[PDB]
């Protein structure tokens, strides 16, 4: 209840941590630990009736975010773990079910079968990109194919539970919490050309409500970097 980091404070009341391991620290990489370790609340998305899903590429949603974004232009390298708090707040008269899954190395697929998607289309900075429940056509050149039953990666979307995940059932549950360690092949990588995590929120059972209730429900994502450090002097 009412946890705080730096100059921010959020409140909480069930956590699922990564692949079982907890994030920790390692020329010489220096340790900045107090200046940017805080809760970065992104803006809320609206869960409507015929909504399809959302995604965020994770070391890119915190690129225009304050002093964390200032520490990226000053540093060529870095390695960072995360802690993600997702909560949506509806009444007891709404009903639905969300899957909050955190995918490492999620290559997206382009709509044209020869090309590859562009950086403006793969990831909106600190802004959610949307799945669709129709097909993106082949005629446009560089756009992400977002048929949500394939999850944009050419796979069964029901089998996405092999990644570290959490269900949000409005009947019983209210929030989700993930703690994701640093997963990469190299120990310290180029932070400008690599988005090594992807946070997806997909409504399996759609939102429903009776006439009179509030016709859409907000979802609030909060990311807090754990064990961030960069390389330089």
């Amino acid at each position: 209840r009412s946890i705080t980091l730096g100059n921010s404070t959020i409140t909480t009341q069930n956590v699922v941590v990564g692949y079982g391991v907890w994030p920790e620290y390692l020329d010489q990489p220096t340790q900045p630990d107090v200046a940017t370790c805080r809760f970065y609340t992104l803006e809320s998305v609206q869960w409507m009736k015929n909504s399809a899903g959302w995604w965020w590429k994770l070391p890119d949603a915190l690129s225009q975010m304050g002093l964390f974004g200032q520490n990226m232009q000053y540093h060529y390298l870095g390695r960072t773990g995360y802690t993600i708090h997702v909560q949506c707040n509806a009444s007891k008269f709404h009903q639905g079910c969300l899957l909050v899954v955190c995918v490492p190395e999620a290559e997206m697929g382009c709509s044209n079968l020869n090309n590859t998607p562009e950086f403006s289309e793969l990831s909106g900075g600190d802004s959610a990109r949307m799945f669709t429940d129709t097909q993106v056509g082949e005629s446009n050149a560089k756009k992400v194919q977002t048929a949500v039953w394939n999850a944009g990666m050419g796979v069964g979307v029901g089998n996405l539970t092999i990644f570290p995940h959490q269900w949000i059932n409005l009947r019983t549950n209210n929030s989700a919490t993930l703690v994701m360690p640093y997963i990469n092949s190299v120990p310290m990588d180029n932070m400008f050309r690599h988005n090594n995590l992807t946070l997806m929120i997909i409504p399996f059972v759609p939102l429903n409500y009776s006439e009179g209730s509030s016709p859409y429900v907000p979802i609030t994502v909060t990311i807090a970097p754990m064990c961030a450090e960069y390389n330089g002097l």
Partner: antibody
Amino acid sequence: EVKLVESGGGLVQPGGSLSLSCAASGFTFTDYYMNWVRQPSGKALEWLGFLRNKANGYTTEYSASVKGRFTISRDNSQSILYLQMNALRAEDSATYYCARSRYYGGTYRYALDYWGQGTSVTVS
Amino acid sequence: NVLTQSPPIMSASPGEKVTMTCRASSSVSSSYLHWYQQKSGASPKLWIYSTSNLASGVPARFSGSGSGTSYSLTISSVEAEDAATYYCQQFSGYPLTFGAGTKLELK
């Protein structure tokens, strides 16, 4: 009841521009897909494009024949659907309809349930 | 993916059963094939959606069928007020292609 009227057709020199407009009343505008279909004089129908609802982000999906020339949009104030036609040719002389789609289960079958009365566009 | 309708011109007296077919070039799914009806000097109307389901306000004389790459539409008893043109729509990829048109004139 559902009522889709539209307006804006007329005469145009080939190589010019024209803007159609579809006025929608009788339903919530931000919840359905809205299409654009043309038909020439006594020929088959031809689908030009649609525009998804608010929950899918108002993205557009043009046909391969008119991609780059035409533009579908909407007005954010009132429930008016637009069609900016640019670079008109000799074979664009047709009757332009305005259609709507809905979800039948929870799925989106690609049918068009309600149609507009049709405005006519011809070139000279 | 183009659709061919046959026959183009169809004539039949009222009271009998007549049917038309719409054969696709490739495989179209059973849920993405629809039938429309356009009278002379009027806009089309959705008639049958997803190859077997009657729309709203349509009389029960019609029943669509077919699967794979061959689809059909049957009229159990032909009246006088349902003489129009009938188109079939599909979706395998974009765009949404229509049929050629089947014109029904009463005899």
